[PDB]
Amino acid sequence: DLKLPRQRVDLVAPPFVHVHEQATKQGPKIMEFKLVVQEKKMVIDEKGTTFQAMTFNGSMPGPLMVVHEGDYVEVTLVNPATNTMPHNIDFHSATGALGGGALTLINPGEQVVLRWKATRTGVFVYHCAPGGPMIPWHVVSGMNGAVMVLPRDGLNDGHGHSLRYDRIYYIGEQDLYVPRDEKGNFKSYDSPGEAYSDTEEVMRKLTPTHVVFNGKAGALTGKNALNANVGENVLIVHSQANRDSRPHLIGGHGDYVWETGKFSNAPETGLETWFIRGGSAGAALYKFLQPGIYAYVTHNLIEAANLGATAHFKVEGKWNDDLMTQVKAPADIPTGSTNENLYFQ
Amino acid sequence: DLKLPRQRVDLVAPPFVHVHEQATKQGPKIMEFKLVVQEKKMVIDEKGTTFQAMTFNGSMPGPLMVVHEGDYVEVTLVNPATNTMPHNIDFHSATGALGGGALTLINPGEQVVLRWKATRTGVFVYHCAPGGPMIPWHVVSGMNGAVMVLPRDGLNDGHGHSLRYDRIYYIGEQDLYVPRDEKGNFKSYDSPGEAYSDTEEVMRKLTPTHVVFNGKAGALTGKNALNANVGENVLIVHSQANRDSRPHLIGGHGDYVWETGKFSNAPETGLETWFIRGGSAGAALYKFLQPGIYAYVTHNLIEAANLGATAHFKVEGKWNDDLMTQVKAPADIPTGSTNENLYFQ
Amino acid sequence: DLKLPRQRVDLVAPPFVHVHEQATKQGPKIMEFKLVVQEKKMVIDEKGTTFQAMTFNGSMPGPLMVVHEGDYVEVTLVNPATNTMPHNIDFHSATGALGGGALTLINPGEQVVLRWKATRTGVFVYHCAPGGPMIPWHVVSGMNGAVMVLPRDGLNDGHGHSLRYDRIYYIGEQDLYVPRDEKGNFKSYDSPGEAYSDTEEVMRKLTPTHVVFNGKAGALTGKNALNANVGENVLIVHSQANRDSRPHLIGGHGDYVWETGKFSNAPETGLETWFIRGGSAGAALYKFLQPGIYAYVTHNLIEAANLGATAHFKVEGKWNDDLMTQVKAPADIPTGSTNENLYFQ
């Protein structure tokens, strides 16, 4: 009885995002997405540590789904018989039935079709939540992603002016809990079930061993740095399904930030660092003003540098010496300098 | 010389709240409350672990006090001689004398009467704070609650429209620090003083062993689930006197949320997850749109599922298939399906 | 080619702040500051524990720099040859080159001159960031401070009214990671390089051993309590370069708080406790209404009382019995009292 146009969306792997319109004059549609659960061993750091992961569509995070206010979202969730455990899905964007989790529990070899109406604008987490202690374990094993519900008029600045991005990236941050042996080395396991009891012990102490973007330390550095150009307005969606984060663009700012992630609320302007509460997604716009490398981090710098949570942007364009310049390059401290007379000596 | 009507309020045990008016045309009154300190052993999880607690009025959290802007609040704090330690009270809603703590220190066998004017609207923490290392120890042993100071016109949406709740609940979240023996089992003690040195060692590592609502894992699940009905606007006051929390209603949203908890500031709309800074109370309104079970959690899901921090709502009414529906129930993956051709394989 | 008046600013040690104008009709200037790196052993708690610190200008935090929107800030960073490591500086207030870090790396015996334009208003962190795992280590060793960029019209309340402070203090909060030996005692080292490997092990577990204001437990208590007077509007700038904090003035409120620290956004009013995200600075105004001692804490009370994070204000003036009064001093519980009949017994 729901008589609306259907449109199939093909998702893509983060940090990229499937094609979509920002503002639209299309009416509501049934937007059709498919997510396939994949349990698999994955590499999670630069020394090659492996991890028994559980994923939607084979990536951590799961892919970003993008729809508009008033759309209906029809998700086919597939759990292939190569998997070992039951899984489900819960959308923070949806209303009722534990976000859908109470309607989507599937054993290996099954699939299920859920439809939810996109009544709330913003970016939101989705994640597996099979029940009881399985809920944190499936989420911290990788089973989480995000959905963005745009207003039909696109974003605005909360003061009646339109905002448009030239580029969008989805940064999913994952806290991981990898057991260590007596000597302090990370342990390997042959299946998720085998990893569980030792992993739950690490989870109970609430301190991750790794905090990574796009599934692995170094995932978005080197060859896979994020590209941009001076002058582009870039939207950075950040999610964390289980633990707080404090995003910061080193060398930049958040020009417009919805740190609680919901477009019915005006964004804050000109932030240095913002805050993603565990269990949520947020979003920040920035217009690049300078070329060069930028690091995007969580600004617990121990997590950023030592546990895996740094991404890079490589920005092409012309340097602006008015905004910043090296007035004098490193040189020897002048013989005639008198720093021994300073107040703090 | 303060010549105002006096009115005695009888408090009730959380998560319920004493009767009160939201909007009022009554002028300022002296609102009279009594809190009695009770030290006692309490059960704090589903395996029966006991804990040497310290409470106001025998509950964790202490009861919610509700007054209106401009009222004076006259609290009699009683420390019976069955107790072993000095106690006091500090109201974050009050001005001066460390929130009252500097005027309320009482030994066992004593009582004291403090009056403070309710000049600041919002929900606020109160807690014991005897001095030095006793302050965290008394708070994490259970000695904290909240007070709500409503505007005399009731709540509003920050854009000139009145908000009214049909139902109010007070969720106090408590981080607990229970010592373990060599084998990892929780230790029992015969008095608070006996528990102190081992408890302080756990406190120093900043990682709770339990994170509970209404004093115990499972307190607000099963028979003691919170009731509501489709269509009701429910106010959920959440406090945490010592540690951050990130509340989330699974299956719902925060329609209007004052996460810093102060009604002079407009609420944010349509949140998935909000943030209670340690040392504060916040409040969220939600109008239920779907029947069924909802879980209310802190969205560190390890804390929610494994350390005790889940409550349930049981909501009666009719399901709305427009907002969400199971289009196809779990079924075998069709023989003819082609999932091996997906981008991520 | 930048033809503007130059003005040299002499910095002072926190928590005080160099002299400056709040509102100004002066046009943009080049504001000249000098920071000298000093590595040195410092005492960090009341039992005399020492720490191999690294500082700007010999203090933790580094000094507060205050400029106005549109100024250019020309910083000479000096690394004397008595130091052992390379250092640099990154300003969250600046645009480009990792906030300046990519233009300021200096070996011992060198200095460098960076100029950045103050295009963003607010309070912001600055810190050393030499590269890779050196970044967290230099920051948690003390190499961080803050800069305030005021609007040229001074502060306002976001609703078109001017705000002016009578007094400003800069509270820098530092999380420290001090190794312990087998017996649990803090270890001492003869140099930063010698401390590094054991310190990095403590850093990886993300739990500080000390959380201090102005560099040491007790720094701003006793003789060095902060002064104020009833009626004064006091601005309290709080920074944390690496870890979240939740500031609270015990006995007071935040009348106007910019917890994300950026003056383009209206402040929130009447807060009990606010939140400084790690990697940021925030600011709160309060007009003192009562004399006496106030404690300013992070409201994880374990950190405040047991790990060093308490400051005091000593406020002179006349008590206001209307706002708060002790109606009856501690007395014996009346023989005739009937507390055994209360609901919770």
Ligand SMILES: OC[C@H]1O[C@@](CO)(O[C@H]2O[C@H](CO)[C@@H](O)[C@H](O)[C@H]2O)[C@@H](O)[C@@H]1O
């Ligand atoms: O009290 C009514 C009764 O109906 C149930 C039957 O399973 O289902 C309702 O809720 C479901 C979603 O949670 C809907 O899919 C279903 O169609 C609706 O009828 C029970 O949950 C409930 O006890």
Ligand SMILES: OC[C@H]1O[C@@](CO)(O[C@H]2O[C@H](CO)[C@@H](O)[C@H](O)[C@H]2O)[C@@H](O)[C@@H]1O
């Ligand atoms: O400097 C004045 C002096 O007055 C004291 C005396 O104890 O008390 C004032 O503050 C109290 C609350 O903190 C009030 O109850 C009291 O009535 C008021 O006079 C001292 O604290 C202070 O040194």
Ligand SMILES: OC[C@H]1O[C@@](CO)(O[C@H]2O[C@H](CO)[C@@H](O)[C@H](O)[C@H]2O)[C@@H](O)[C@@H]1O
């Ligand atoms: O692609 C251009 C090229 O220019 C470089 C040369 O080192 O420098 C630019 O960026 C610097 C700041 O990061 C400025 O100081 C410099 O003046 C500007 O020309 C490279 O980083 C870059 O590869």
Ligand SMILES: [Cu+2]
């Ligand atoms: Cu799963």
Ligand SMILES: [Cu+2]
């Ligand atoms: Cu969730």
Ligand SMILES: [Cu+2]
């Ligand atoms: Cu007490």
Ligand SMILES: [Cu+2]
């Ligand atoms: Cu307090």
Ligand SMILES: [Cu+2]
């Ligand atoms: Cu350095």
Ligand SMILES: [Cu+2]
């Ligand atoms: Cu930084």
